C-alpha cells in the first residue's frame, strides 16, 4: 500500500525573483529531485524511470520543463491580476500524485497551498477552491479553468499516467522497497531520564520498550521517527526513574529485520 508524492515548493520574493524546487517520494524513499538550478529532472534511484521507455520519459520531462517556466509566469501574472489583494513574498506548494491500492485500484490527487494553507485542488475536470479558501481566488480559478489544454493534460496525468507510471516503479524498485536493515541500539542517561537509542532500521515499523524482565514499563515515552542520511530511520524511547532503580532495566527492540531475535540491552 504505497503513496507516490510529487512535492513542489516555490518562493516568489518580489515581481522579478523566484525559484521552484521539487522532490518525489514513493512511500518514504526519494525517487526524483528537480532543483531550480537544473534544466532536467534527476533520478535519485537506478529504477526512477520505472517501466517507461526513453521516449516516454523524454516526453514527460519536456512537459514538466514547459510547465515550470509557464507556472512561474502564471503566478506572477495572477498576482498582477489580483493586486492589491495579495502581495509578495508568496509561497506556493503543490502536492500531487496517486495512492496505489491492490489490484488495478488507485486514487490521484493534486493539492495546492498558498502561504502555507491548503486552498486549491484539481478534482474531476477542473480546479476548485476547498472549504476555508478566500473568495478572491474565484478569479484565478475561473482563469485556470478557461485553459482547456491544461485541464485535458492534468486529467490525463492524474487518471492514467500517474497510476501506470507508479505500477512500473513498484516493479522496478522492488528490491529497494522491500529492503530490510537492522536496528542498532545503545543506552545513556541525563537528569533521571534513561534514553534507549535505536538507529539504522528500515522499514519504519518498530517496537521499543523499557523492561524489567517481562514487565513492560508503561512510563516509556517514544519520540518521533527521525531520518538518517542513508535512508534508514532513527527513534529513541525515554523513561523516568529514581537514581537506584537502573539495575535490572533493559531496552527491548522488536523489528522485522531481526527474524524474531530481539535486541535486549541491559543497563
Amino acid at each position: 500500500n504505497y503513496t507516490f508524492r510529487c512535492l513542489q515548493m516555490s518562493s516568489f520574493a518580489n515581481r522579478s525573483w523566484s525559484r521552484t524546487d521539487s522532490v518525489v517520494w514513493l512511500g518514504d524513499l526519494q525517487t526524483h529531485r528537480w532543483s531550480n538550478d537544473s534544466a532536467t529532472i534527476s533520478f535519485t534511484k537506478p529504477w526512477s524511470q520505472g517501466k517507461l521507455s526513453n521516449q516516454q520519459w523524454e516526453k514527460l520531462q519536456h512537459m514538466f520543463q514547459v510547465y515550470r517556466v509557464s507556472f512561474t509566469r502564471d503566478i506572477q501574472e495572477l498576482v498582477k491580476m489580483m493586486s492589491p489583494k495579495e502581495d509578495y513574498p508568496i509561497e506556493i506548494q503543490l502536492s500531487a500524485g496517486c495512492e496505489m491500492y491492490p489490484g488495478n485500484a488507485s486514487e490521484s490527487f493534486l493539492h495546492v497551498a498558498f502561504q502555507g494553507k491548503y486552498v486549491v485542488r484539481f478534482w474531476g475536470t477542473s480546479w476548485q477552491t476547498v472549504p476555508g479558501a478566500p473568495s478572491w481566488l474565484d478569479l484565478p480559478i475561473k482563469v485556470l479553468n478557461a485553459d482547456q489544454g491544461t485541464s485535458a493534460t492534468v486529467q490525463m496525468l492524474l487518471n492514467d499516467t500517474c497510476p501506470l507510471f507508479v505500477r512500473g516503479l513498484l516493479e522496478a524498485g522492488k528490491s529497494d522497497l522491500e529492503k530490510q536493515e537492522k536496528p542498532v541500539a545503545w543506552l545513556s542517561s541525563v537528569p533521571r531520564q534513561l534514553v534507549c537509542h535505536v538507529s539504522g532500521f528500515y522499514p519504519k515499523p518498530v517496537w521499543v520498550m523499557w523492561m524489567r524482565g517481562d514487565q513492560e514499563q508503561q512510563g516509556t515515552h517514544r519520540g518521533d521517527f527521525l531520518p538518517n542520511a542513508d535512508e534508514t530511520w532513527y527513534l529513541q524511547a525515554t523513561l523516568d526513574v529514581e537514581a537506584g532503580e537502573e539495575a535490572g532495566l533493559a531496552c527491548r527492540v522488536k523489528h522485522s529485520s531481526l527474524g524474531g531475535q530481539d535486541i535486549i540491552l541491559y543497563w
Partner: T-cell receptor
Amino acid sequence: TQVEQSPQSLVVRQGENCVLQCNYSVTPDNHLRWFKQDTGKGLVSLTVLVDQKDKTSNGRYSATLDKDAKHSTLHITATLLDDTATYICVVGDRGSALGRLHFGAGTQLIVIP
Amino acid sequence: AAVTQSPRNKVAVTGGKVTLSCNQTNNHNNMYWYRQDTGHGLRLIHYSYGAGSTEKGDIPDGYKASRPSQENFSLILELATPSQTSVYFCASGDEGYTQYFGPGTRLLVLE
C-alpha cells in the same frame, strides 16, 4: 522575433491559389490565428487552429497546423481582388487571458484582377 | 464583443501630450495596447487586468497607461516623439485567450 512568415510578399493573378507559411519558436504554443488586414484597416480573424495536428476552413481560406514542426500554412483558393491585403500569423502561448500573443510581421498579397 | 478607439487619426508635435483612448462595453476585465510598425508584428506596450490596474508590456518606455474604469483604457504619451509615429491597437478580453481588437489609431508626431 519568435514568429516568421514566408513569403514576405507575393503577386498573383485572380483565380490562382496561393500558399502562405508561418514558422515559430514560441513555447508553449496553445493556438495559432490567421488575421487578414486590408490597407489602413484592422484585423479580421480568418481562422484559429488549436490541436497538435489541426486543419480548418472558412470559405476559400483553409489552413493547417503542425505543433511538432511549429508550422502553419494558410491556403487561399481561387483568389479575388479583395484578397489583396496583409496576412498575419499570431501564436498564443496560453489557453487563457494569462497568455501573450506573438505576432508575425505579415505577408503582403497583391491579386491582379 | 466590440471595441472602439478615439481619436482614429492624430497629428501631433514633438514634446506635446497625446492621449489615445480605448472603449469597450463588453464588461471585459482585461485590456491591452499594441503598436504596429512596418517590418514588425504587433508589439505589446501596456495592459490591464481591471479598473486601477496598469502593467508594463514589452515596450512600455515613453508611454503611461490609465485604466480609470472597466470601460476605458488610455495610452498617454506625455512627451511625444517622432519614434512614436505608428498605428496603435487596443484590445479587450475576458478570462479566455481571445483578444477582441479595436480598429486602430494612426499617430504622426512631426518635429
